[PDB]
Design a protein around this ligand. Structure first.
Ligand SMILES: Nc1nc2c(ncn2[C@@H]2O[C@H](COP(=O)(O)OP(=O)(O)O)[C@@H](O)[C@H]2O)c(=O)[nH]1
Ligand SMILES: Nc1ncnc2c1ncn2[C@@H]1O[C@H](COP(=O)(O)OP(=O)(O)O)[C@@H](O)[C@H]1O
Lengths: 332, 340, 322, 238, 318
């Protein structure tokens, strides 16, 4: 069968199908009306439609047939280094521009340049971005770049000045939940009440991760029999999220403050295979946004959680770090 | 052979604990063509590798168990010679790229591609996926995207935290919790009934489970050792047999608690040197020492809190260092100061 | 027509100062003790002008034959530039007896292996070839390359000279700039004329009427992709005055909607807090130590939300000492 | 020639002398001199300091401070210096941090526990222990390669869990059955493709109460001869 | 016009007696040159201390007129390829240039520690094949990274950083040979700036002589590109944290000095703060080194320097 990820399957086809990004779409339409397309810097929260909008703009610029030969999509974050990305861009630019057919010319403007799209450009180092700017300057005659990122401030000033910047607003909860519901209804995914909201909460509003998690949940639901509805426990299991009941038990054990009880509970918890990093993240979310703790407690617990997360990021023993964090919180 | 290996389940029907996971694996094997990439994460000695092999047997057949071993040499930039021990079969491959240190990426890219060239598909089982470098994980994501037609990856790890998000998105996460003490007792009872081992009461098996901390492999090996010592007749008074290094570490804990001085630290250094020289990992030594210290009944809450804090600090230092004896001695000295 | 190439200092008169480098190199040439030079500093200080003036003084009418000007950031390759250096060194002329100068602009962008190969080439051809290396930062070069080159630091331009050059550019290009925008541009460029010219050109391009419109500070900050001081001040005020929930919500909302990285937000908050009048030294000690720790942890990855809450907690705890 | 090997001993003895850490002694032997002492044979100075910093009687103890606290602080600094050394000698090649590693590994811990050498300056034991650990890890790798097709474990799991039971199945039967257990021992070895060299190597991995040197020596030579003869008299799986 | 001969190149050591530091290693090399029959050797030490220069001087002493073609220097990490440099080594070694019976052809390899085990084994085989005429010297930073078969065949020499006395002696020799007017404080400043770096010290001396003629502290510090030690001392010893931060902002950060130079000068100044007790100096050095390590890991911001100053002030006030 023609298996395809739902993220790339449900991308909007034209600029008119972008829902919430009115400002960016309007500015892009105005720029497209002009005969000149400058270098573009798409920035905003993840899963807002940056790649979808640039792909729709490309499709309207070239056409469904020519756009695939006129597009170079790269991910500088996932690549080995600067050399591979820059060599691929150089080879794409030096390659002869594909000649548009009669239908493409008579139906679409077909500008004489090709578009290079970079994903996660802000993850690049300063030297990598300077090299990218030099490469863009060298081949600026026949290629227009589009840098997709979450933080415009992570891009150096020389590279950012050359690009017209488009800010994408974070998607509203209603819009994201409606998109997820439409995708689920089109794919005949039976979801219980609150499952889509749980998926969005786990993804932290990232519609890309939400769609990926929904597809994974559907795939898991096919394996299980009886055709039962997908439940929040299944999507929590698939995303590696500790259940809320275990978190409440951890909080109660910390509140009681007994060292031996906390040690026993952490020992019996490390046997269940739950990720310690997920526990730390959920404890941070629970404690920081809780109205039952005063300012001093949160001031101390923020530093405690920061230290525990920093030590966990170094590839240490989860059991020791989790026990130390829980004991330190219980001593507050 | 040892009872841990002789009675290992060789099929999905022979699995006895974690029935939900067994049903899930059966459902997965019911549709071999659309098999997703899998990442099985859980505590050590819980049956992850056994379940992976059982799933492979369900998909292909018993021929996956006719395993061969071969050393493969890889040519790399700088003209270095790297040898990888591939446990191969006429249906699947097993690799542990972490044994190649930081070269694992160039080991993977050279190997997986070759497999895709040699091919419905050939499964590859990557052990210790959590200890792979980030570049190796990026190469693994690249091979997953490029060769999803002929390559299906089954990664096994004890913690999914070091795994990167791009791998997690494209793989099916499978959580393998450690078996409960009742299931361990049932498995040991089946083993002893198969081996005709006398039991004064079943409670002994329960104790063995409580001694293994959910580690099924450790529980089975402990049961075999206890049976061998007690002339194939386990009594209620039969002592629990612990490994040599665990006994040494417990003796070290008792020594540290009893006497806190510079000479005691000097002798703890010799004990640690022996343990490290006989292939006991530093992180294992630190974890066992910390959790033996926390179990001493004469220490108050303040002492235990200081001990666990120092354990966390020196665990980070061990993960960021080279010479392990330095960090172990520092931790022991700090604990001695705290107790005194 | 880039504005960096235009208005470039072509003579020593255009250079504000730094005649000491010229005099020292002139004495080196006169005494026959000219070493491999390494001019490093911010762009536009006059490194290229100084070296070309020295080359013209040394040679004169045969400048094009005794001088090889190369740019290490042309990205042609290591082998091609090595071949160019070798064929320039091997082409000796009887009527043009003397050492041959090789200028290498923007050498700090090279990889470490390329720098080591360049150092080996420099050692190989030191008998008849002298190397001048131009760099923005000397610390980016390998120690082996640094040790073989006599270092000359070009000090950043004074603010008065930068303002005079900006006024000259504005009157040349008929551009009107607000004083706040001028201050923001000067602060962002950090004494780099190339950044000033590029940002001014881009802002002029983005204007709907580049002849009858004045560039504001908001336009400058948008063009440079830098955090606006108003946003950082709002975040700091929310952290200092509002409770934990409001501070957390405000920080996350501002740094996600405006696309400000946590490290850049930390840097801006530190810069703002420099001007605060604190009654206790321990407040500043705690602030600096905790914020540096958080930034160092951010550099290694980690949890983003946890680090943001750590920043909020660090500031709140430090300001409890008044 | 022997002065080359004697130099680290002299450096360690001088750096642990408390007189150069007093107020008067600091002026005569400043911090630059101590860092220079480190930079003379910088390969061995951190190792010698880590080896000998527990054998001193401190004369620089602060009031209210015991010897144990001083050695704990010295050990903390030594581990920090080890981390710095790892970062220095990695592929990053951060040799500019050598002076810092001078203070973290040698000078500061010496300052914490400086005094009179209570005994003799002993050479660092870390090199021999590291070589021994490498040899035993190679032996464990060979054993794991031999037994991988029969055991479902990694190398570390083989050492920690399987080897104690392999001891009971390969050495214990001899003590209680004389030469009558040779057939069973050979059968167990054949079930895991274990050679006689592997049998010899396995018994060397045990520590504490499980040491097998004296136990193996106590086994009669006739039993060992019969075991090796029976092993050499039959073919084995490979 | 004429030929350009910089002091760093003119006064580089040619004979073995021109080397100042490493008295034991230099004595061993002098004995080897005196008795002839140079054995295969491995010289190990931190990079940048001129390890290869000593064996070059030994080769000059052994061969002399035949040095121009009887010595092959190569880099193990050459970008051209390990295979091509190994082939060059073999081709040079199999040649049979006429040499006196008491002397042998010499091959010097730099950065030999980065070679893989197979390449090292091949080099050992090549050395053994042509051991009758060609001898090998391997320069490395870490001696442990050289395989045991190579280590056993060679004699190990260890090279250490030059002390301030050696740098002072070399500078005095250069000054006497160049009739340079100087002062004691100027030489002290030059030695202070270059921590055992002979090449940097000679370059700074030449630049100071050209720029001003008389070598004193003021002229040396004007020539030297590092931050002025007096400014860093004022920043470190300031009794108020605001004063230290203001000095850092105005005089060091805004003056274009990189964070690496700032921390290096802070380390150098803190080593020599005789007015402060050595325990406080060690604590300050530990903090400075921690921030230096953070900078070298890629942070290198102004906030790190501000935190370093805050910690130093906290230590100072006790
Ligand atoms: N009887 C029985 N034994 C099991 C089961 N699961 C695991 N084991 C035993 O557990 C031992 C170790 O499992 P292992 O493959 O090492 O799992 P892993 O190391 O955690 O990935 C095996 O030797 C099995 O004998 C089960 O369902 N039934
Ligand atoms: N405005 C939008 N309307 C509808 N769907 C959207 C919108 N923005 C994002 N999506 C969904 O997000 C998915 C891809 O997200 P993407 O644009 O790649 O995220 P990012 O903005 O990080 O590039 C698509 O499947 C698409 O359905």
């Amino acid at each position: 069968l023609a298996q395809q990820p739902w993220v790339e399957k449900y991308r909007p086809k034209n600029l008119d199908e972008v829902t919430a990004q009115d400002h960016a779409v309007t500015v892009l339409k105005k720029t497209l009306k002009s005969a000149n397309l400058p270098h573009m810097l798409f920035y905003g929260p993840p899963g807002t439609g940056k790649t979808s909008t640039i792909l729709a703009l490309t499709k309207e610029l070239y056409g469904p047939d020519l756009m695939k030969s006129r597009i170079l999509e790269l991910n500088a974050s996932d690549e080995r280094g600067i050399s591979i990305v820059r060599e691929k861009v150089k080879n794409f630019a030096r390659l002869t521009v594909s000649k548009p057919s009669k239908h493409d010319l008579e139906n679409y403007p077909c500008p004489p340049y090709k578009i290079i799209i970079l994903d996660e450009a802000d993850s690049m180092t300063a030297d990598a971005q300077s090299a990218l700017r030099r490469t863009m300057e060298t081949y600026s005659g026949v290629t227009r770049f589009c840098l997709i990122c979450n933080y415009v401030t992570r891009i150096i000033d020389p590279l950012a000045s050359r690009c017209s910047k488009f800010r994408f607003k974070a998607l509203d909860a209603s819009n994201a939940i409606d998109r997820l519901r439409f995708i689920s209804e089109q794919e005949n995914v039976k979801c219980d009440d609150g499952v889509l909201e749980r998926i969005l909460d786990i993804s932290a509003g990232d519609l890309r991760r939400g769609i990926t998690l929904l597809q994974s949940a559907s795939k898991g639901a096919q394996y299980l029999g009886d055709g039962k509805n997908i439940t929040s426990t299944q999507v929590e299991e698939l995303a590696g999220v500790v259940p809320h009941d275990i978190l409440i038990e951890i909080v109660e054990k910390v509140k009681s403050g007994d060292f031996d009880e906390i040690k026993k509970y952490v020992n019996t918890f490390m046997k269940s295979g739950w990720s310690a990093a997920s526990v730390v993240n959920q404890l941070h979310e629970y404690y920081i946004t809780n109205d039952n703790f005063d300012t001093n407690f949160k001031n101390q617990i923020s530093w405690l959680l920061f230290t525990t997360d920093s030590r966990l990021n170094n590839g240490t023993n989860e059991h020791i770090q989790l026990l130390n964090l829980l004991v330190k919180i219980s001593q507050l | 052979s040892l009872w841990v290996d002789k009675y290992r389940p060789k099929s999905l029907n022979a699995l006895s604990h974690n029935e939900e996971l067994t049903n899930f694996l059966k459902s997965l094997s019911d549709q071999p063509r659309d098999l997703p990439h899998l990442l099985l994460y859980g505590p050590n000695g819980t049956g992850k590798k056994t379940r992976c092999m059982a799933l492979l047997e369900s998909i292909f057949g018993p021929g996956v168990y006719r395993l061969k071993i071969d050393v493969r040499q890889f040519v790399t930039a700088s003209n270095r010679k790297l040898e990888l021990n591939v446990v191969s079969s006429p249906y699947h491959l097993e690799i542990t790229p972490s044994d190649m240190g930081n070269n694992d990426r160039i080991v993977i890219q050279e190997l997986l591609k070759e497999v895709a060239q040699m091919e419905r598909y050939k499964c590859v089982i990557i052990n210790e996926a959590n200890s792979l470098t980030k570049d190796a994980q990026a190469a693994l994501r690249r091979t997953m995207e490029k060769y999803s037609k002929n390559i299906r990856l089954i990664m096994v790890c004890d913690s999914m935290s070091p795994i990167i998000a791009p791998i997690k998105s494209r793989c099916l996460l499978i959580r393998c919790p450690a078996p409960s003490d009742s299931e361990i007792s049932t498995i040991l009872s089946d083993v002893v009934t198969n081996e005709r081992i006398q039991l004064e009461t079943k409670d002994i098996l329960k104790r063995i489970a409580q001694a293994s901390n959910g580690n099924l492999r450790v529980s089975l090996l402990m049961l075999e050792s206890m049976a061998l010592n007690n002339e194939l007749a386990l009594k209620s008074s039969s002592p629990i047999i612990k490994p040599d290094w665990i006994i040494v570490i417990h003796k070290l804990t008792r020594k540290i608690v009893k006497e806190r001085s510079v000479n005691s630290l000097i002798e703890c250094r010799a004990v640690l040197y022996d343990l490290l020289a006989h292939c006991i990992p530093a992180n294992i030594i630190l974890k066992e020492l910390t959790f033996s210290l926390l179990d001493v009944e004469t220490l108050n809450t303040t002492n235990k809190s200081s001990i666990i804090e120092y354990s966390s600090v020196f665990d980070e230092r061990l993960s960021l260092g080279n010479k392990a004896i330095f960090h172990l001695e520092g931790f022991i000295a700090k604990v001695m100061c705290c107790l005194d | 027509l880039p504005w960096v190439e235009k208005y470039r200092p072509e003579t020593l008169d255009e250079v504000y100062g730094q005649n000491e480098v010229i005099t020292t190199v002139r004495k080196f040439v006169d005494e026959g003790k000219l070493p491999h030079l390494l001019f490093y500093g911010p762009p536009g200080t006059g490194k290229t002008s100084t070296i070309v003036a020295l080359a013209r003084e040394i040679y004169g009418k045969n400048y094009s034959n005794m001088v090889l000007e190369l740019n290490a950031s042309d990205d042609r390759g290591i082998d091609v530039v090595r071949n160019q250096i070798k064929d320039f060194a091997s082409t000796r002329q009887i009527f043009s007896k003397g050492f041959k100068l090789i200028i290498l602009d923007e050498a700090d962008a090279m990889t470490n292996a390329a720098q080591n190969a360049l150092r080996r080439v420099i050692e190989r051809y030191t008998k008849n070839t002298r190397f001048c290396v131009l760099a923005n930062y000397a610390h980016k070069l390998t120690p082996a390359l640094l040790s073989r080159c006599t270092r000359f630091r070009f000090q950043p331009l004074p603010q008065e000279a930068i303002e005079r050059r900006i006024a000259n550019v504005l009157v040349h290009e008929k551009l009107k700039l607000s004083p706040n925008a001028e201050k923001a541009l000067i602060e962002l460029s950090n004494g780099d004329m190339r950044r000033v010219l590029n940002v001014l050109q881009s802002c002029k391009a983005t204007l709907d009427n580049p002849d009858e419109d004045e560039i504001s500070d908001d336009v400058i900050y948008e063009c440079c992709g830098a955090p606006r001081p108003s946003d950082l001040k709002a975040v700091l005020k929310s952290i200092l005055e509002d409770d934990w929930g409001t501070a957390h919500y405000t920080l996350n909302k501002v740094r996600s909607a405006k696309g400000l990285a946590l490290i850049d937000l930390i840097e801006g908050i530190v810069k703002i807090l420099e001007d605060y009048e604190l009654q206790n030294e321990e407040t500043r000690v705690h602030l600096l130590t905790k914020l540096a720790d958080i930034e160092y942890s951010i550099s290694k990855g980690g949890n983003d939300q946890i680090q943001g809450s750590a920043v909020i907690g660090a500031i709140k705890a430090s300001f409890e000492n008044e | 020639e022997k002065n080359i090997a004697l130099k680290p001993f002299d450096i360690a003895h001088k750096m642990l002398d408390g007189q150069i850490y007093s107020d008067i002694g600091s002026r005569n032997f400043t911090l630059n001199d101590k860092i220079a002492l480190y930079f003379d044979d910088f390969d061995f100075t951190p190792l010698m300091i880590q080896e000998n910093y527990l054998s001193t009687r401190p004369s620089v103890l602060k009031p209210g401070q015991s010897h144990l606290e001083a050695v704990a602080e010295a050990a903390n600094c030594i581990s920090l210096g080890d981390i710095v050394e790892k970062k220095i000698r990695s592929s990053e090649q951060l040799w500019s941090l050598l002076p810092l590693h001078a203070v973290l590994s040698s000078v500061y811990p010496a300052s914490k526990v400086a005094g009179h050498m209570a005994g003799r300056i002993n050479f660092t034991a870390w090199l021999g222990q590291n070589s021994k650990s490498a040899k035993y890890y190679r032996l464990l790798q060979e054993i794991h390669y031999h037994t991988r097709l029969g055991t479902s474990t990694d190398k570390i799991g083989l050492r920690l869990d399987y080897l104690p039971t392999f001891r009971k199945r390969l050495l214990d039967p001899f003590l209680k059955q004389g030469a009558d257990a040779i057939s069973s021992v050979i059968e167990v070895m054949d079930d895991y493709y274990l050679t006689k060299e592997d049998w010899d190597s396995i018994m060397e991995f045990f520590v504490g109460p499980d040491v097998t040197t004296a136990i193996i020596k106590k086994i009669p030579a006739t039993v060992k001869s019969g075991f090796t003869r029976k092993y050499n008299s039959m073919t084995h799986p490979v | 016009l004429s030929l350009q001969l910089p002091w760093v190149e003119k006064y580089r050591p040619q004979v073995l007696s021109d080397i100042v530091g490493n008295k034991e290693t230099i004595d061993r090399l002098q004995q080897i040159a005196k008795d002839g029959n140079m054995p295969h050797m491995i010289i190990s030490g931190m990079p940048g201390i001129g390890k290869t220069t000593s064996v070059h001087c030994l080769a000059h002493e052994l061969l002399g007129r035949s040095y121009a073609d009887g010595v092959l220097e190569l880099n193990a990490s050459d970008d051209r390829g390990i295979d091509v440099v190994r082939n060059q080594i073999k081709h040079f070694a199999q040649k049979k240039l006429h040499l006196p019976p008491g002397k042998h052809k010499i091959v010097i390899l730099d950065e030999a520690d980065s070679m893989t085990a197979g390449a090292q084994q091949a080099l050992r085989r090549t050395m053994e094949l042509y051991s009758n005429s060609t001898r090998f010297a391997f320069a490395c930073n870490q001696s442990n990274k050289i395989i045991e078969p190579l280590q056993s065949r060679c004699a190990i020499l260890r090279y250490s950083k030059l002390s301030d006395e050696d740098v002072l002696k070399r500078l005095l020799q250069i000054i006497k040979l160049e009739d340079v007017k100087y002062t004691n404080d100027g030489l002290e400043a030059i030695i202070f700036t270059a921590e055992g770096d002979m090449r940097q010290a000679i370059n700074n001396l030449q630049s100071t002589v050209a720029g001003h003629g008389l070598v004193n502290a003021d002229n040396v510090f004007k020539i030297v590109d590092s931050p002025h030690p007096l400014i860093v001392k004022k920043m470190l010893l300031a009794s108020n944290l605001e004063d230290s931060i203001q000095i850092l902002r105005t005089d060091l950060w805004k003056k274009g000095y990189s964070s690496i130079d700032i921390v290096t000068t802070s380390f150098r100044v803190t080593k020599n703060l005789a007015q402060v007790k050595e325990s406080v100096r060690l604590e300050m050095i530990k903090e400075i080194g921690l921030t230096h390590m953070r900078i070298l890991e890629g942070v290198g911001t102004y906030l790190q320097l501000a935190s370093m100053l805050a910690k130093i002030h906290k230590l100072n006030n006790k």
